[PDB]
Amino acid sequence: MVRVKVNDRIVEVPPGTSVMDAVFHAGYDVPLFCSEKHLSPIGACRMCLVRIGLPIQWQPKLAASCVTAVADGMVVDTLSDVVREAQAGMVEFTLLNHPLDCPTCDKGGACELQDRTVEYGLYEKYPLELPVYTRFEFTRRHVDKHHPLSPFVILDRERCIHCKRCVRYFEEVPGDEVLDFIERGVHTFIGTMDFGLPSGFSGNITDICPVGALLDLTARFRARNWEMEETPTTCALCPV
Amino acid sequence: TGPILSGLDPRFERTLYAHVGKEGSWTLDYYLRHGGYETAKRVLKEKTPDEVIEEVKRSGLRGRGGAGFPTGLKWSFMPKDDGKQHYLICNADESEPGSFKDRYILEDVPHLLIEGMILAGYAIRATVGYIYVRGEYRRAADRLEQAIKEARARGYLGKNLFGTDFSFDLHVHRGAGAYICGEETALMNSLEGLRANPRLKPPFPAQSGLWGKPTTINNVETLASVVPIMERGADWFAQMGTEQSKGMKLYQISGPVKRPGVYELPMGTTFRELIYEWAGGPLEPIQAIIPGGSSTPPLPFTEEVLDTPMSYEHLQAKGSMLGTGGVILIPERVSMVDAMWNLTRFYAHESCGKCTPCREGVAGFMVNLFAKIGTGQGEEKDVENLEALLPLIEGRSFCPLADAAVWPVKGSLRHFKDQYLALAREKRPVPRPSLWR
Amino acid sequence: ASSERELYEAWVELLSWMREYAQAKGVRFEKEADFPDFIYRMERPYDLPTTIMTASLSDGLGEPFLLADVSPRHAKLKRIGLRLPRAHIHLHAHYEPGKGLVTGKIPLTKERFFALADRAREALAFA
Amino acid sequence: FFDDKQDFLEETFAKYPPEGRRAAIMPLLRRVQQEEGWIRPERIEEIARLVGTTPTEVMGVASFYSYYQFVPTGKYHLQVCATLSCKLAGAEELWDYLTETLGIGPGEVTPDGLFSVQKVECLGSCHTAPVIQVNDEPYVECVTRARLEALLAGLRAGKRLEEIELPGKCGHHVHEVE
Ligand SMILES: NC(=O)C1=CN([C@@H]2O[C@H](COP(=O)(O)OP(=O)(O)OC[C@H]3O[C@@H](n4cnc5c(N)ncnc54)[C@H](O)[C@@H]3O)[C@@H](O)[C@H]2O)C=CC1
Ligand SMILES: Cc1cc2nc3c(=O)[nH]c(=O)nc-3n(C[C@H](O)[C@H](O)[C@H](O)COP(=O)(O)O)c2cc1C
Ligand code: SF4
Ligand code: SF4
Ligand code: SF4
Ligand code: FES
Ligand code: FES
Secondary structure, three states, rough: OOEEEEEOOEEEOOOEEEEEHHHOOOOOOOOOOOOOOOOOOOOOOOOEEEEEEEOOEEOOOOOOOOOOOOOOOOOEEEEOHHHHHHHHHHHHHHHHHOOOHHHHOOOOOOOHHHHHHHHHOOOOOOOOOOOOOOOOOOOOOOEEHHHHHHHEEEEOOOOOOOHHHHHHHHHHHHOOOOOOOOOHHHOOEEEEEOOOOOOOOOOHHHHHHHOOOEEEEHHHHHHHHHHHOOOOOOOOOOOO | OOOOOOOOOOOOOOOOOOOOOOOOOOOOHHHHOOOOOHHHHHHHHHOHHHHHHHHHHHOOOOOOOOOOOEEEHHHHOOOOOOOOOOOEEEOOOOOOOOOOOOOHHHHHHHHHHHHHHHHHHOOOOOHHHHEEEEOOOOHHHHHHHHHHHHHHHHOOOOOOOOOOOOEEEEEEEEEOOOHHOHHHHHHHHHHOOOOOOOOOOOOOOOOOHHHHOOEEEEEEHHHHHHHHHHHHHOOHHHOOOOOOOEEEEEEEEEEOEOEEEEEEEEEOEHHHHHHHHHOEOOOOOEEEEEOOOOOOOOOEHHHHHHOOOOOOOOHHHHHHOOOOEEEEEEEEOHHHHHHHHHHHHHHHHHOOOOOOOHHHHHHHHHHHHHHHHHHOOOOHHHHHHHHHHOHHHHHOOOOOOHHHHHHHHHHHHHHHHHHHHHHEEEEEEOOOOOOOO | HHHHHHHHHHHHHHHHHHHHHHHHHHHOEEEEEEEEHHHHHOOOOOOOOOOOOEEEEEOOOOOOEEEEEEEEOOOOOOOOOEEEEOOOOOEEEEEEEEOOEOOOEEOOOOOHEEEEEEEHHHOOOOO | OOOOOHHHHHHHOOOEEEEEEEEHHHHHHHHHHHHHOOOOOHHHHHEEEEEEEEHHHHHHHHHHOOOOOOOOOOEEEEEEEHHHHHHHHHHHHHHHHHHHHHOOOOOOOOOOOOOOEEOOOOOOOOOOOOOOEEOOOOOOOOOOOHHHHHHHHHOOOEEEEEEEEEEOOOOOOOOOOO
């Protein structure tokens, strides 16, 4: 198997492994929005960036660890100042136009954006200088809000960060295309002409959306993510 | 004189743009009367595909879309035999500002392009090919379909061409005016019935293109340049330009000049020759020029700059690059801030939205930064921040359009950040003089 | 300058028109979102006239066809905006003194907005 | 819409592989645009049913390009190029004068019923700037105030673009500026 090195660690890993899996299998960490388990990785959020050497032969531009294959004897750097500064910058770009709904957002604590923001954002700039959070002091993007797409799912087009998870899933897993973007640029937004949301497996996007865009109407405004008492069990509605 | 072509030396032979504008040049009869389709006849029955590929490989013919990759080696990357159907893609999406050169090739000399596409299809075993034209070129599209119909009637596109075991056919597909759809991997999405969000480059279209077939995409100027190469020598082609820039190039110029337009000139002519001998010299004092297209970084108006040979190497060593040879003159009467303003707003209009940096920063932040600066609102803070912003976008995007936005701004700062500071520290809007009549 | 004030005032005025249309064609109007600087202002004092920032006209299917927004209280480059979803149509109005509410240089009167919303209803609304 | 024309559908679907029917979304949509002036949802549903795909994908596609209009436009949809070259030739003042005279927004239509406005990026004729396009047709190039107002007075009286007297010279591939 192929030998990879992450910042202090050497890992055996099968050849077809993505660099991201080699980082995490190596025990390091990297932001993650565009990619998902069982979904085709495509470099979209540009969060998964690492440094890659393949001889010390450092790459010119940052490598997308979500769509990078791994080669034997590669050096992966996730702790260099450049990588951390770039990840914080991309978080800044992503939260740029976000609707300021966290306290009243149904996603609350179990929101990947919140966690990766507090994880990687605001690189240590060098004093005890009075810090500034956001540079964006302009008018934010405002689109349609709290729109029920279906008797189970509600849609907030402002919270979408334009990942591909729901449409990637919709084409891949059920094979039922009842969702895709409409326009382009920053005006891009999610919509449908199939209104009943006919596919019998739509609910999973509720869990996948790294933001609170698509939320469960049957569980909207009941309790907070940490507040619910979890009971892991097995469903007996059908024999699977 | 020692054999080297760098300008107006009298041994230059117009090949592509010769018949442009001549009335009835779009008739197949015109093309035939000047020796057309002879090169297809000779190559199809004499040469093998590897031979016509080696021919263009030795021609030094580099990609005419702006890339510069040897189309010979490019075709050498193809499977070159697999049993599957292959496709040849004509990229007729011309969307870079200041670029109007291929338009009239498509309008007035189509059968040159058709012969070149037949040559490339013979080279790469392409039996069917598609021509993707932008939704703003209707005259060229009409003339192209007319030419294809004529060739189909007189037996130039058929089951078996000229007795040999090769086949070829072309099909036109009109676009709807989207700059990103010109991207070679996004064009295939747009045609295929998808939204034009680019594809992964590590799989190249030579190995996976339209509908999974091994397609090859070449620029219109490249396909047209194939025909003379096969016609009269590859060395004759390589007779023009420096050691890394062989052949001729279709330069075009726009701006406050006496007679802007197109000139089929060798690679390496000085900017002074182009603007002054040909375009008649500027009409107003120019503060800078954008050589390649719009995506290229501006360079100052200097004598040591005016002497620069327009090539794939001399501009490389000066910081800018030769995208299309489409020069635009920026005068002192218009602020650089306003020029890059319009550039960034244009690139914001045309982003696909996949990459966070391009979509968000460019369409929301960068354009807003330029607006605040040049509308009499900015402060030095915005210029510092925008200065730091570009390296956060350049390195990491799925398609280089994002880099296409920062490099012109990047250089615009490295030579004219001072200007912005003025408009920052004066809190002055960009000057708005009356320019049109 | 101080034009901002009247703009927000003018913005409130705009909302009235929207609501009126709702009763005219019997079409659903919805308050989309209120000001954050009014929810999250805890003790801080608040002088703005209304609390609503974003609203829309939704068709029978609930999908909006017309959107209107106003700039927040502390943001740079303040404006009022209109958008037709799915139609790639954006309008950006200011308030010029003496003239009134104007889209750039062209006045934005009640009749213009009524016609625009009626065109959206006839064309874009699915049901 | 495409019910009437099945020969055209056969011709378009023969241009693409039997599995690549979806490519046909591009031409079919276009045929609607120039025929009816704007794209209705029914057109999109019909394109999907004919081509064997979901209306959602087709709508996303159609809204991806700037040319495809989904609201009514005037009989003469004046597409104004606003790019660098055309601005340097006065697309700012041209656009300002045009819109202020006609009194329209880019989303709405003149009450006369034949004039709509829209900004467009590079029309690929830069030396002859400024440039304007009328809904599908070869550009009216070298647009000066006289050229614009004459084109307007002609179109107002029902003159076909092919038959309108345009003052001034517009070069083919080069053009003399004086
Ligand atoms: N309208 C216009 O004329 C415009 C022109 N441009 C110019 O065009 C350029 C865009 O060209 P790109 O598509 O980025 O080309 P590129 O430089 O990335 O690659 C050139 C060609 O060779 C192939 N290639 C490169 N490396 C390869 C490898 N190792 N193995 C196999 N194949 C390989 C690529 O697939 C491509 O077809 C811009 O950088 C700019 O200069 C850009 C925008 C608009
Ligand atoms: C974002 C993007 C946009 C592009 N737009 C164009 C274009 O409008 N016209 C063009 O000829 N090439 C364009 N290209 C370059 C393509 O690579 C080009 O079709 C291809 O290089 C043709 O190959 P050739 O130059 O070897 O003949 C674009 C590339 C990118 C990345
Ligand atoms: S999606 Fe996440 S970051 Fe955004 S408002 Fe909801 S909890 Fe906050
Ligand atoms: S709605 Fe959610 S899952 Fe879908 S693209 Fe947006 S962020 Fe991703
Ligand atoms: S740089 Fe990224 S977001 Fe921008 S057009 Fe290219 S792929 Fe789309
Ligand atoms: S994680 Fe690789 S770009 Fe989204
Ligand atoms: S700039 Fe308007 S046509 Fe190229």
